[PDB]
Amino acid sequence: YDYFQFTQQYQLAVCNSNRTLCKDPPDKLFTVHGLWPSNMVGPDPSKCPIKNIRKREKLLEHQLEIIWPNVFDRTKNNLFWDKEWMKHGSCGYPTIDNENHYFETVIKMYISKKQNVSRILSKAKIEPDGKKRALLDIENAIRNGADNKKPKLKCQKKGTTTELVEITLCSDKSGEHFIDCPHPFEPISPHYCPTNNIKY
Ligand SMILES: *[C@@H]1O[C@H](CO)[C@@H](O[C@@H]2O[C@H](CO)[C@@H](O[C@@H]3O[C@H](CO)[C@@H](O)[C@H](O[C@H]4O[C@H](CO)[C@@H](O)[C@H](O)[C@@H]4O)[C@@H]3O[C@@H]3OC[C@@H](O)[C@H](O)[C@H]3O)[C@H](O)[C@H]2NC(C)=O)[C@H](O)[C@H]1NC(C)=O
């Protein structure tokens, strides 16, 4: 892999995204959607051969229930985390050593390193108040909490309302320094965030 994408999702909007109902009530919070070893050119790696097989402890799972829930059905959390490890975590060796280290690394980014996107936005005076916002104000807020580096944003359109859904912070191969995210969505895409009137 070349770099990492750490993607967080705003639960309220995810649960308004498609024909799959969230059986559990969402919070107005950004929690983790993925940590993806990624490639600068072409497709990202997927399902890389593993180097070890490990069991998760309850305490790790309890933190992931809070920081990385399956927002559609929390009863499917274990199989959901197993797939994130198998599809993505497995491709980050040796920076990511094993399954437990993969999830501990995500918790370290979100909590210790203050990468909780709800917190970064709140520090810039942007709360989940359901207001229409300019794209640059959301981008400026994230860059101010991420070493000036440009995030990748995902939005969705619902009727006449476009809402913010995901924010990705990208980092270098070691995951120790942020980098600008390559590959932003093109304007024709229904995942593209327009310059104005984004609801959050
Ligand atoms: C990801 O980041 C988000 C955004 O920062 C975290 O969510 C935010 O979490 C804080 C708590 O840490 C929460 O604030 C509390 O909200 C409740 C309900 O409205 C209040 O009752 C709380 O006030 C009481 O407690 C504080 C002590 O923390 C005390 O100072 C108050 O007087 C009172 O006893 C508290 O409100 C905060 O009070 C302090 C003030 O400085 C803050 O401005 C005010 O918010 C936020 O509501 C919550 N924000 C959101 C958008 O939900 C989230 O926890 C974090 N995720 C993880 C896993 O860490």
Curated annotation (Swiss-Prot):
PANTHER family registered for this protein in UniProt: RIBONUCLEASE 3, RIBONUCLEASE T2
Disulfide topology: C15-C22, C48-C91, C155-C193, C170-C181
UniProt keyword S-adenosyl-L-methionine present: no
A Gene Ontology molecular function term of the record: ribonuclease T2 activity
Protein's UniProt keywords contain Repeat: no
Source domain of life: Eukaryota
Free-text function comment from the UniProt entry: Self-incompatibility (SI) is the inherited ability of a flowering plant to prevent self-fertilization by discriminating between self and non-self pollen during pollination. In many species, self-incompatibility is controlled by the single, multiallelic locus S.
Binding site for RNA: Q9, H33, N70, V71, F80, K83, E84, K87, H88
Catalytic residue list: H33, E84, K87, H88
Catalytic activity: a ribonucleotidyl-ribonucleotide-RNA + H2O = a 3'-end 3'-phospho-ribonucleotide-RNA + a 5'-end dephospho-ribonucleoside-RNA + H(+)
Modification after translation, per record: N-linked core structure at Asn-116 contains xylose.
Keyword set, alphabetical order: Disulfide bond, Endonuclease, Glycoprotein, Hydrolase, Lyase, Nuclease, Signal
Gene3D superfamilies, alphabetized: Ribonuclease T2-like (3.90.730.10)
CDD domains, alphabetized: RNase_T2_euk
Homology family: Belongs to the RNase T2 family.
Biological processes per GO annotation: RNA catabolic process
Protein name (Swiss-Prot/TrEMBL): Ribonuclease S-3
A cellular component annotation (GO) from this entry: extracellular region
Enzyme Commission identifier(s): 4.6.1.19
Pfam families: Ribonuclease_T2 (PF00445)
